[PDB]
Each structure stands twice: as structure tokens, then as C-alpha cells.
Amino acid sequence: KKVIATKVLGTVKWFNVRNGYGFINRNDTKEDVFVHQTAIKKKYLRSVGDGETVEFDVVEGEKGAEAANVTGPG
């Protein structure tokens, strides 16, 4: 729950709706961050598309950094 960064922009590398997670590449550091489906703000009410630009917070999850509050840019 510890917030590391906010209003980070990134590109969805892939998001798998069967597994319910994917990875976003941060535009500011070029590092991949894990994104779980429950972290996406609202058929797939919580999903993002491969190649999409998204805005998110980076928080400290159980297994390291992860995306939170994932939305479109702006």
C-alpha cells in the first residue's frame, strides 16, 4: 500500500484477461511494473489493452512494486 510514485505514465506491454494481470512499461524509468486486474479503475470492466498509454500510481505490493489506480492519461 506504500505509494512510491504518482501520476506515472507508461505503455501496456501486455495484459492477459485469462490470468488477470500484465505488465506496464514506465515511460520515466523504462522498467516494467506488474499490474493486477483489481488495480485498474473501471465484460472486462477492469482491463487495459496491449500498447495503450496509461496513467497510474506505483505502490509497494507483496512481491515488490506494482501499479495502482490505473487509468487513461489525464
Residues 6+ apart with CB under 8 A from 20: 36, 37
Near RNA by CB under 7 A: residue from 23, 40, 48, 58 = 23
Question: Please, what is the minimum distance in Å from the beta carbon of residue 51 to RNA?
Answer: 12
Near RNA by CB under 7 A: residue from 52, 57, 65, 69 = 65
Phi, psi of 50 (to 5 degrees): -55, 130
- Nine cell digits for residue 66: 506494482
Question: Please, what is the minimum distance in Å from the beta carbon of residue 55 to RNA?
Answer: 19
Is residue 66 at the binding interface for RNA, with CB under 7 A as the rule?
yes
Point out which residues bind RNA (CB under 7 A): 13-14, 16, 18-21, 23, 32-34, 36, 38, 61-66
